[PDB]
């Protein structure tokens, strides 16, 4: 009974897990690991106030 099911694996995205919002389009949360994003990319995207991320499906569109 997830509130934020991961856009890839459908398991809950918890606040204590590395995860990112697809602000580009679909607005689903995705576990970092599910996306194949490295820890460094994750930290970089976090630090970039002006950057947003899109999931592979949304970016393909």
């Amino acid at each position: 009974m997830a509130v934020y099911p991961c856009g890839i694996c459908t398991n809950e995205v918890n606040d204590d897990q590395d995860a990112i919002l697809c602000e580009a389009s679909c607005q689903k949360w995705f576990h970092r690991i599910c996306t194949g994003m490295t820890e460094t990319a994750y930290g970089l995207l976090t630090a970039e106030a002006s950057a947003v991320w899109g999931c592979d499906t949304c970016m393909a569109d």
Binding site: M37, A41, Y42, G43, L44, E48, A51, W53
Partner: peptide, 30 residues
């Protein structure tokens, strides 16, 4: 700022590795 820069995972992964090497520049287009 008002601008929003959109990264795929692939681009974020590449950017991250380059940032560690001190290569921080990316060319804006559209």
């Amino acid at each position: 700022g008002a601008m929003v820069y959109v990264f795929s995972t692939e681009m974020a992964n590449k950017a991250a590795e380059a940032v560690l090497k001190g290569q921080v520049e990316t060319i804006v287009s559209f």
